[PDB]
Amino acid sequence: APDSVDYRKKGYVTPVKNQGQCGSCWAFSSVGALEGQLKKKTGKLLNLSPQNLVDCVSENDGCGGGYMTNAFQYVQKNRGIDSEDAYPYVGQEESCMYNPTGKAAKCRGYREIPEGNEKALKRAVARVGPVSVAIDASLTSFQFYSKGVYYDESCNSDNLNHAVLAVGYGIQKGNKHWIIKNSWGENWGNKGYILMARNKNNACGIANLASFPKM
Ligand SMILES: *C(=O)[C@H](CCCC)NC(=O)OC1(Cc2ccccc2)CCCC1
């Protein structure tokens, strides 16, 4: 009886969002990780504010990209992150309008998964919850994905360019996989999700930049 986990059934995941014309993949990924830990610690979750991260995380580059660890760092220093409702996503960077009245979660730090270790990533997903990850999502085969377990050998593990959220893992038709929540709208892939090959030599670099927030 193989290990399997789907945090969507557990109430750790919010509906799929859409970055729009904004390289904010990392903000949705971070918010997604924070949301999982929120549910796990407080028993309930809310939609956190990715726009809050885009505008305030000065260490990152807004619509120009950013690292999830900088996001977590920010929330800890700032002593809070706004809810999606208090700081709505507009799809482009603007001045930092963080307001403590709309706080919906806190962060006390973060941990990175040892680079390249899918086993460690598997344990983290199982012991912590949804984990922020990065991959190479530039391949056409990746972008037009619709079902099954994605695997394309050309995927370059040394070219991480898109941040996502690992909300679980398991196996389909004999092929092990990671359950990945994207931020290109539910119109993308399978209702916004995509199953990516797991234990297939770290395909797409799925484990080269994984981390989660301590809450
Ligand atoms: C996801 O929307 C962004 C898109 C960036 C627009 C150019 N991807 C991203 O943030 O990539 C990471 C950070 C980064 C950005 C640019 C060059 C190098 C690194 C890399 C993996 C996760 C975020």
Swiss-Prot record:
Subcellular location, record wording: Lysosome; Secreted; Apical cell membrane
Q: What is its EC number?
A: 3.4.22.38
Q: Name one GO cellular component term.
A: intracellular membrane-bounded organelle
UniProt entry keywords in alphabetical sequence: Cell membrane, Disease variant, Disulfide bond, Glycoprotein, Hydrolase, Lysosome, Membrane, Protease, Secreted, Signal, Thiol protease, Zymogen
* Active site as annotated: C25, H162, N182
Q: Which reaction does it catalyse?
A: Broad proteolytic activity. With small-molecule substrates and inhibitors, the major determinant of specificity is P2, which is preferably Leu, Met > Phe, and not Arg
Q: Which disease is it linked to?
A: Pycnodysostosis: A rare autosomal recessive bone disorder characterized by deformity of the skull, maxilla and phalanges, osteosclerosis, and fragility of bone.
Biological function: Thiol protease involved in osteoclastic bone resorption and may participate partially in the disorder of bone remodeling. Displays potent endoprotease activity against fibrinogen at acid pH. May play an important role in extracellular matrix degradation. Involved in the release of thyroid hormone thyroxine (T4) by limited proteolysis of TG/thyroglobulin in the thyroid follicle lumen.
Kindly provide the name given to this protein in its UniProt entry.
Cathepsin K
